[PDB]
Amino acid sequence: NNELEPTPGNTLRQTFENQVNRILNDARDKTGSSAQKSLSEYNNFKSMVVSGAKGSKINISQVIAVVGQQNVEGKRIPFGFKHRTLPHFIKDDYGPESRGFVENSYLAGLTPTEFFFHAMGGREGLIDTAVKTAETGYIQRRLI
């Protein structure tokens, strides 16, 4: 219905993608916080969470609460097919089910579409790490 006055400095597409991403991210963060607060005293994950909270909070939240939205190049899953992420969806589908949001956690198991979207996200992460290590090594050598 697009009444929905867009925010200044961005077009409709960017503004609404930002809104959807913000909603998904804050929902994921709230679910993760609730899952972490669920562990009262006996959960063995809480022992690592409260002490080693450097980078283990997100992994625990994914394990218990929700894996979360999968992003590619800082954006949701692109329409690889003709205006469609996977052939199992409908054309021009911008809902949470598509575009790479994993509703289920790791315990509940990922649906095949969610599995493929997470595979895409992990591949992007592997590429980013592979380039980042080499670039950091080059920067270190140049600086020293």
């Binding site: 697009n2 077009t11 409709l12 597409r13 609404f16 003709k82 205006h83 469609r84 052939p87 409908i90 054309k91 021009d92 589908d93």
Partner: protein
């Protein structure tokens, strides 16, 4: 707005031309001597805003696409067919491009509109 005018005997394009003795716009082919009276009096128009009717580009044939999201709530007003097919503009160079156009899913009747 300007369309296109073609020379007849040479089957080539007609270019704008001016005759001082009559002081009026004409269209003449540069490789021949044919001249035609110009009625539009506007050689071209530039639309940098790019305001184009997407409904004209849409063809009714796309109504029979299984991948498209068929809908039931919005009926076609031309023939009363309840079922329709809605899809976005998906056209480049349009910053404001998410409007949903509906094509009637009638048996090859066809109707394109927007709600």
């Amino acid at each position: 707005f300007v369309g296109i005018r073609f020379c007849q005997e040479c089957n080539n394009m007609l270019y704008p031309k001016e005759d001082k003795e009559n002081r009026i716009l004409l269209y003449a082919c540069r490789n021949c001597d044919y001249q035609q009276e110009a009625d539009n009096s506007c050689i071209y128009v530039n639309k940098i805003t790019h305001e184009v009717d997407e409904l004209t580009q849409i063809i009714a044939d796309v109504s029979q696409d299984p991948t498209l999201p068929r809908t039931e709530d919005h009926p076609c007003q031309k023939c009363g067919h309840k079922e329709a097919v809605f899809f976005q503009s998906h056209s480049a160079r349009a910053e404001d491009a998410m409007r949903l156009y509906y094509v009637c899913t009638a048996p090859h009747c066809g109707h394109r509109w927007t709600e």
